[PDB]
């Protein structure tokens, strides 16, 4: 045996706590701070990713790219 | 219906085909349809030859296998209707029967 490479490290998840990425104030006014995935398959329920240069929809896998 | 039908009989053996080709035509004569004579097609002979050993080590003995397929064609032609008249099949397991028409 004696593989030249070390044993491959499997990815470990970030282990996120409660999501809490949307805020209301002044006795409650909704503010989606995340982009909404527009597709029917994503739905109006889910939010999109907030990457530094694009946005990812978890189901629709649409990437909205901004320069 | 005025119908002119074609009936084929086939199996692996000869005896069952012979007794079917006999009893059907006898029933037809008793039931007064004129019958086209029994036509025996040439026998299919499926030949398969295979090494007896399951190993390949030995004296190269090839075993051969044969499946004789015999088939007969008899046509029923009557001035009257046929299918409403004759319906009984009298078929043993092992023999295949297929009934076609003149247009088929």
């Amino acid at each position: 045996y004696t593989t030249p490479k070390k044993n491959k490290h499997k990815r470990k998840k970030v282990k996120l706590a409660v999501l809490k990425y949307y805020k209301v104030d002044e006795n409650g006014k909704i503010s989606r701070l995340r982009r909404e995935c527009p597709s029917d398959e994503c739905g109006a329920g889910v939010f999109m990713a907030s990457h530094f240069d694009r946005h990812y929809c978890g189901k629709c896998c649409l990437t909205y790219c901004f320069n | 219906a005025i119908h002119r039908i074609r009936i084929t009989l086939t199996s692996r053996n000869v005896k069952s085909l012979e007794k079917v080709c006999a009893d059907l035509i006898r029933g037809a004569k008793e039931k007064n349809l004129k019958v086209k004579g029994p036509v025996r097609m040439p026998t299919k002979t499926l030949r398969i030859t295979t090494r007896k050993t399951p190993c390949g080590e030995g004296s190269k003995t090839w075993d051969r296998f044969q499946m004789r397929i015999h088939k007969r064609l008899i046509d029923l032609h009557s001035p009257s209707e046929i299918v409403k008249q004759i319906t009984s099949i009298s078929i043993e397991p092992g023999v295949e029967v297929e009934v076609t028409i003149a247009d088929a």
Binding site: - | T10, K44, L46, M67, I69, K71, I91, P93, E96
Partner: protein
């Protein structure tokens, strides 16, 4: 015609169907004194006849097990529904059936008898 295969492949498929059914019933009805299977075929429907010593055993509760195997063969080879019937025939002179006596001996030896 184009849908129906030739005579040769037809006989081949018949033999394959028969061998598979016999082997399945052997592997499944091993303890029930399985002796042999007979299939009677008509274009309207087919009839399957199973020879076994313990017909009362191969038939389940109110015919449950025979229904089970009928559904098995129905869904396996894909017959039209209700075009296959499973008849269990009690063999005569079980001492003459080589398969049944072989299975009884194998059952005895697996039991641990001398």
């Amino acid at each position: 015609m184009a849908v129906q295969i030739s005579k040769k492949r037809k006989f081949v498929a018949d033999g394959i169907f028969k061998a598979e059914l016999n082997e399945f019933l052997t592997r499944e009805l091993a303890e029930d004194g399985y002796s042999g299977v007979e299939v009677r075929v008509t274009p309207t429907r087919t009839e399957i006849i199973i020879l076994a010593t313990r017909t009362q055993n191969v038939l389940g509760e109110k015919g449950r097990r025979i229904r089970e195997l009928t559904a098995v063969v129905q869904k396996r080879f894909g017959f039209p529904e209700g075009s296959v019937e499973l008849y269990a025939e009690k063999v005569a002179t079980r001492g003459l059936c080589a398969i049944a006596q072989a299975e009884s001996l194998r059952y005895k030896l697996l039991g641990g008898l001398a």
